[PDB]
Amino acid sequence: MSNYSVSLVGPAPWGFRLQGGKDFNMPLTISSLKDGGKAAQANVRIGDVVLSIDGINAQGMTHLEAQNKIKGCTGSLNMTLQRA
């Protein structure tokens, strides 16, 4: 439950998948990592919960809202996460 921040250097793909969001009744969670991708290089781990994306609290977001914030991110991808 300890928190950390990442600022991944672009361009995407960022190297991960999500599950969850409000429309799935679970918090947004890192659900897969591409081997050697940028998220893995920043030691993001499967199961870590995404608390914010670009400073916006992730709690209210749907799955698609989080995906699009990530996909359409200009420059670096800033997120805060909670360790599983």
Binding site: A12, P13, F16, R17, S32, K34, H63, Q67, K71
Partner: peptide, 6 residues
């Protein structure tokens, strides 16, 4: 719904 790589 589907597996979407980001």
């Amino acid at each position: 719904d589907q597996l979407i790589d980001l």
